[PDB]
Amino acid sequence: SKFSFGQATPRTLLGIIRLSQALAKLRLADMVDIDDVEEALRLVRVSKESLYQPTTKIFTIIKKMLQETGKNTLSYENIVKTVRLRGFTMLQLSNCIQEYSYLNV
Amino acid sequence: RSSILASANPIGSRYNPNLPVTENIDLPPPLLSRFDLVYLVLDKVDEKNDRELAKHLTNLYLELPVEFLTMYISYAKEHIHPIITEAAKTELVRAYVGMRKMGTATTRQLES
């Protein structure tokens, strides 16, 4: 993409290790956890940053089902269940289906 | 009289498959023909081998043996003197002929 800094090598892997060991060793810690491993990964990512200076929420589930089963029916049983499980009220779903009935779906 | 082990970086920064193999190596053919083995070590991005490599590296920084190996090596160099058999002779001939027929197959590779 002409966008990277020259790829990431296995040296980057040991880069994470040494930074995590160094960060933990600064706080006198004898063990290293995610709070510093993520910080080590943060430094090898922040350095490159200077170069770079609800109807859809319902319809996405329908589209996912149209990929899983693809049945273009008018009556629905899986959509109503999953949308209800997602926390919506069926009035919102009814309006969502009504709009897409007009919107070429 | 000695053995040479050499490591060479690719021309430029990284290996480029667009250029031929001889253009990624900064050695003239007369020198390049002498080496018995040239290993093209290429770095892929396949996780099916990257993850296994990662495990092998990561399992080593928490908390046959060399004595057997050197004892084995020192014994073989001292007592073993193999002789090429008649049957094995033909294979060397055919392998070089086939390798030559694809036309850098100098005779220095045949003694290799």
Q: Write the CB contacts of A56 (distance below 8 Å, at least 6 apart in sequence).
A: none
Q: Is B61 on the interface with A (CB under 8 A)?
A: yes
Tokens 């290996």 sit at which residue?
B15
Four-CA torsion B34, B39, B40, B43, nearest 10 degrees: -150
Q: Write the CB contacts of A21 (distance below 8 Å, at least 6 apart in sequence).
A: A32
CA separation for the pair A1, B86 (Å, rounded) = 58
Backbone angles phi, psi at A71, to 5 degrees: -80, 120
- Interruptions in chain B after residues (C–N over 2.5 Å): 63, 103
Residue of B nearest to A21 (CA): B61
CA separation for the pair A19, A37 (Å, rounded) = 8
Q: What's the one-letter identity of residue A5?
A: F
Verify whether the Cβ–Cβ distance B54 to A13 is below 8 Å.
Answer: yes
Q: How far is A103 from chain B (nearest CA, A)?
A: 43
Residue of B nearest to A10 (CA): B54
Half-sphere CA count of B11, side-chain side, radius 13 A = 12
Q: How far is B77 from chain A (nearest CA, A)?
A: 37
- Interruptions in chain A after residues (C–N over 2.5 Å): 53
Look at residues A54, A77, A78, A84 and name the one whose alpha carbon lies nearest to residue A64. A78
The answer to whether A11 is a known ligand-binding residue is yes
From B13, B43, B57, residue closest to A13, measured CB to CB: B57
CA separation for the pair B31, B28 (Å, rounded) = 6
Q: How far is A29 from chain B (nearest CA, A)?
A: 15
Look at residues A88, A31, A85 and name the one whose alpha carbon lies nearest to residue B63. A31
Q: Is B54 on the interface with A (CB under 8 A)?
A: yes
Technique used? cryo-EM
From B13, B43, B61, residue closest to A17, measured CB to CB: B61
CA separation for the pair A51, A1 (Å, rounded) = 14
User: Which residues numbered 62-81 in B keep a CB inside 8 Å of some CB on A?
Assistant: none
Q: Is A22 on the interface with B (CB under 8 A)?
A: no
Q: Which helix (H) or strand (E) holds B14?
A: none
A40 burial class (0-12, 13-18, 19+ CB within 10 angstroms)? buried
Residue B30: C-alpha distances to residues A3, A93, B1, B5 (Å): 40, 77, 19, 17
Verify whether the Cβ–Cβ distance A13 to B61 is below 8 Å.
Answer: no
Q: Is A6 on the interface with B (CB under 8 A)?
A: yes
CA separation for the pair A22, A36 (Å, rounded) = 9
Q: Is A104 left (phi over 0), alpha (psi -120 to 50) or beta?
A: left
Q: Can you give chain A as a three-state secondary structure string?
A: CCCCCCCCCHHHHHHHHHHHHHHHHHCCCCCCCHHHHHHHHHHHHHHHHHHHCCHHHHHHHHHHHHHHCCCCCCCCCHHHHHHHHCCCCHHHHHHHHHHHHHCCC
Q: How far is A14 from chain B (nearest CA, A)?
A: 9
